[PDB]
């Protein structure tokens, strides 16, 4: 990997924390608080009494064959090998009382979905650091594990007071993906237009999903369909029509003048409807916006703590 001294220190520390954690049991967890819920799971701040550690415990209730559940639990153990400063830490996964538990590092900042709601809009200079972290995490996944994230969106980008930005809820388990897809219905979608239509063009799909998110976080509103005229000056569509619009209408784009030109070009390169013309990780990592944002000195940690109301 390519870590500076702080990142390498923090990951070594994480693994040594994981050492105190043995076989994970339902009885060894004390519930502290609720963190959030989504289409399939509910997440809790919990205390692992044996080690004293504090974790985020996702619970998924799937009505599925025991063999499928066991295969999911088996495939999920690969998350032990997925160590990066841009990937949420994994402590363990197990089954109990009809529900699958995924135990993760607690990120005190939450997801960028929550942070967006508390911020209204996220400034371009912050979204640059976010873009760097997301690109680098997707890259780690593809180059160390041949994994594409498969669900890039604000809800699955986590942040914390120590400044870190990490990816979460990515498709490490195919059986889990298949099980989730046979159930609940969303109200918006971050799926690429080629994925909605069939075969997915490697990580390019993820990249579109990132760009869309970057637009949502920049204007403070999910950008399908784009603001007609009146909504834009301030500075519900059914799911099928949203998918139809994503596939058949032009891609969303940032409003001009209010955002820098490099960032506009960045998100437009990320939102090309043809997946081959669409920019890949190689190309985005050296894009004008990314060189500039990599240079800029931004206190992401302080911005986040101010936005949520925390202290340092």
């Amino acid at each position: 990997l390519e870590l500076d001294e702080q990142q390498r220190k923090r990951l070594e520390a994480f693994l040594t924390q994981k050492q105190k954690v043995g076989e994970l049991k339902d009885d060894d967890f004390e519930k502290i608080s609720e963190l959030g819920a989504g289409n399939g799971g509910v997440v809790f701040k919990v205390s692992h009494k044996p080690s004293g550690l504090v974790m985020a415990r996702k619970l998924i209730h799937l009505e599925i064959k025991p063999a499928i559940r066991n295969q999911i639990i088996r495939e999920l153990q690969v998350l032990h090998e997925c160590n990066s400063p841009y990937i949420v830490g994994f402590y363990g996964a197990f089954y109990s009382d009809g529900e699958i538990s995924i135990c993760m590092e607690h990120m005190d900042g939450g997801s960028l979905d929550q942070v967006l709601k508390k911020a209204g809009r996220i400034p371009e200079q912050i979204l640059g650091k976010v873009s760097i972290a997301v690109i680098k995490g997707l890259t780690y996944l593809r180059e160390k594990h041949k994994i594409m994230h498969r669900d890039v969106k604000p809800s699955n980008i986590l942040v914390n007071s120590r400044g870190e930005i990490k990816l979460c809820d990515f498709g490490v388990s195919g059986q889990l993906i298949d099980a989730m897809a046979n159930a609940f219905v969303g109200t918006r979608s971050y799926m690429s237009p080629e994925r909605l239509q069939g075969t997915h063009y490697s990580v390019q799909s993820d990249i579109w999903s990132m760009g869309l998110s970057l637009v949502e976080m920049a204007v403070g509103r999910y950008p399908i369909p784009p603001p007609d005229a009146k909504e834009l000056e301030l500075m519900p569509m059914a799911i099928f029509e949203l998918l139809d619009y994503i596939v058949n209408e032009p891609p969303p784009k940032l409003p001009s003048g209010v955002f820098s030109l490099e960032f506009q070009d960045f998100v437009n390169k990320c939102l090309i409807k043809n997946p081959a013309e669409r920019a890949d990780l190689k190309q985005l990592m050296v894009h004008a916006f990314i060189k500039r944002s990599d240079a800029e000195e931004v206190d992401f940690a302080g911005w986040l703590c101010s936005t949520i109301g925390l202290n340092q």
Partner: protein, 275 residues
């Protein structure tokens, strides 16, 4: 009020689980009941009145293949009280437990489901959410359909005009239901399409679109007409007439699907000629 249940008369018990439009608990109300805490806690006045009218229609329904609808409470929060059903749902049997039914029994399940749907349609009731999750095998013999109707609480309102939104699973939704483009998408024929998906479950042991692992892909392609259940997954012991009836109920175009008297007659007819 009429068929209203007062505040503290129901023993609310163990949590069973959550679905498209509520959370089910086991309870007591002159016997065991299912108490569904609806996902519409605070309802608008017009909505609550339409809900009362719908409950009045549902309370009149009685059939051997229909779970009894018993009433509703309004406090501590809005709920539904229905017949509790020992034994697992058709989904649990086919897709979790993997119960090995013989074709005679599979056809009998289809026939009883069609009986219940025929009755519901004769009383002019659109089920809206037919699926194997809402089909129970009581004593393993009788088929019981639940969670029918209740349109006024499957969506949420802003005044007298009601919003309209997709809920739960997409596998049983007809293309016109997926799209929401047509003025009123829900019809007898949407229930017929859902019944065709149930027939697919019975005759393949599988949910449709088993190879596809993208939810939104299914929504888009099924709504556009690009994707239909792969009927070649149907087992060898499945009668040809049942396959053709399945394909008839699954037509992309709403008007082409048969109604449930004809479906029931076909199922009975073919139940005769059997090994």
């Amino acid at each position: 009020d009429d068929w209203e249940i007062p505040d503290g008369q129901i023993t609310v018990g163990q949590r069973i689980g959550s679905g498209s439009f509520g959370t089910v608990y086991k309870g007591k109300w002159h016997g065991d009941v299912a108490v569904k805490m609806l996902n519409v806690t605070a309802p608008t006045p017009q909505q609550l009145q339409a809900f009362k009218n719908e409950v009045g229609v549902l309370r009149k329904t009685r059939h051997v293949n229909i779970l009894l609808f018993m009433g509703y409470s309004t406090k501590p929060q809005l709920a539904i009280v229905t017949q509790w059903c020992e034994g697992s749902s058709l989904y649990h049997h086919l897709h979790i437990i993997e119960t090995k039914f013989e074709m005679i029994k599979l056809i009998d399940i289809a026939r009883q489901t069609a009986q219940g749907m025929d009755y519901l349609h004769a009383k002019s009731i659109i089920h809206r959410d037919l699926k194997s999750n809402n089909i129970f095998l009581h004593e393993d013999l009788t088929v019981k359909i639940g969670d029918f109707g209740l349109a006024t609480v499957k969506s949420r309102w802003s005044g007298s005009h009601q919003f309209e939104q997709l809920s739960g699973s997409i596998l049983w939704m007809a293309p016109e239901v997926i799209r929401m483009q047509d003025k009123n998408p829900y019809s007898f024929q949407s229930d017929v399409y859902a019944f065709g998906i149930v027939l697919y479950e019975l005759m393949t042991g599988q949910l449709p679109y088993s190879n596809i692992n993208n939810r939104d892909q299914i929504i888009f392609m099924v709504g556009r007409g690009y994707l239909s259940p792969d009927l070649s997954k149907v087992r060898s012991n499945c009668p040809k007439a049942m396959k053709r009836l399945m394909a008839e109920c699954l037509k992309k175009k709403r008007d082409e699907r048969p109604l449930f008297p004809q479906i029931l007659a076909s199922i009975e007819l073919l139940a005769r000629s059997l090994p």
